[PDB]
Amino acid sequence: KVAELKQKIEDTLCPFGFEVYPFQVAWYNELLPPAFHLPLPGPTLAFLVLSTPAMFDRALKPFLQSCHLRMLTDPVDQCVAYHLGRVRESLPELQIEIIADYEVHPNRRPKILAQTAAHVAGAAYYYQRQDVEADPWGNQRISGVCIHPRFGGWFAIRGVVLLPGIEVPDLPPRKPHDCVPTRADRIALLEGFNFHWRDWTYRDAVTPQERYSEEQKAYFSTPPAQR
Numbered sequence: 001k002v003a004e005l006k007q008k009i010e011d012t013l014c015p016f017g018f019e020v021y022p023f024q025v026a027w028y029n030e031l032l033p034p035a036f037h038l039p040l041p042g043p044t045l046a047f048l049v050l051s052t053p054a055m056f057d058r059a060l061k062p063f064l065q066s067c068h069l070r071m072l073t074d075p076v077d078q079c080v081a082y083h084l085g086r087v088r089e090s091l092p093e094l095q096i097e098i099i100a101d102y103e104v105h106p107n108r109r110p111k112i113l114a115q116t117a118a119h120v121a122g123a124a125y126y127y128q129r130q131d132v133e134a135d136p137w138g139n140q141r142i143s144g145v146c147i148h149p150r151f152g153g154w155f156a157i158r159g160v161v162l163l164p165g166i167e168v169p170d171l172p173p174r175k176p177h178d179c180v181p182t183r184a185d186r187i188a189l190l191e192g193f194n195f196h197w198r199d200w201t202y203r204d205a206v207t208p209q210e211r212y213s214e215e216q217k218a219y220f221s222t223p224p225a226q227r
């Protein structure tokens with residue numbers, strides 16, 4: 001049933017530069033404090049949606065031609081919301097829930113922790129400071145980063161599709177690939193992401209099959225307020 005649902009979501013999103021990964025809500029919830037839990041039974045089927053370098057040309061550029069563009073609204077976020085809504089139309093027999101990466105509660109807290117979802121769905125290994133022995137950074141924020149086995153850091157997590165009522169307690173956990181296994185490279189990756197993310201270099205932590213085009217890089221280098 002998972003393969004049938006996966007095919008329906010893939011037929012909707014994969015031609016537009018997206019990738020889809022199944023997971024159980026339990027895997028996500030067990031790694032997090034109760035504050036960040038999804039209010040669903042553990043065996044509930046969920047899909048992690050990410051965007052590849054192809055989504056800029058296949059989804060965003062054609063979307064910037066639609067009659068959907070709104071004033072003071074981010075075009076990428078509108079584009080992602082639109083395609084996630086198309087998943088809803090592909091499954092009329094099901095009542096589905098969709099949470100995008102950019103969504104926040106009234107208190108400005110993220111609705112989902114996109115990187116924890118990407119890790120448990122086996123999409124991209126989530127590297128944190130707790131994955132570095134003898135943590136050398138001290139009392140400062142060291143934000144974690146997911147590395148995709150094919151695109152390195154040349155991707156983005158865009159959302160989760162939740163299927164309440166679809167329970168898969170026997171869904172096998174598929175561990176994400178530990179593409180950055182040594183301490184030295186994990187330190188270089190975490191420092192590249194936290195202190196030099198503007199030079200795009202951390203995204204090459206794994207040799208990518210494809211990078212963002214120079215046009216896509218020029219678009220994303222522009223602050224959202226100026227897009």
Ligand code: B12
Pocket residue numbers: 031032033036100101102110111112113114115116119120126128143144145146147153155156157158193194197
């Ligand atoms: C708010 C936020 C920021 C803030 C704060 C920094 C941060 N990363 O939190 C600011 C504005 C500074 C920031 C900057 C950037 N952002 Co940002 N961050 C966002 C966002 C929206 C929320 C992250 C968050 O609130 N984390 C909260 C903390 C508490 O969570 P945590 O560290 O993971 O801790 C939890 C886990 O450790 C878990 N846990 C415990 N034990 C274990 C064990 C395992 C095995 C696992 C998996 C989990 C786990 O429990 C903890 C919670 O208690 C996420 C998207 C999202 N919705 O998640 C993007 C996001 C992480 N950022 C992204 C990026 C790329 C960036 C930038 C490079 C800028 C850009 N190009 O957009 C920069 C620079 C990098 C940086 N400094 O983080 C991408 C990262 C993609 C990736 N992983 O490759 C994300 C995922 C958005 C996306 N659409 O893809 N961002």
Ligand SMILES: C[C@@H]1O[C@@H](n2cnc3c(N)ncnc32)[C@H](O)[C@@H]1O
Pocket residue numbers: 106107108
């Ligand atoms: C009036 C309040 O202000 C906004 N708001 C902005 N930041 C916060 C926060 N940290 N906690 C709660 N609400 C917040 C909400 O939108 C709410 O309506």
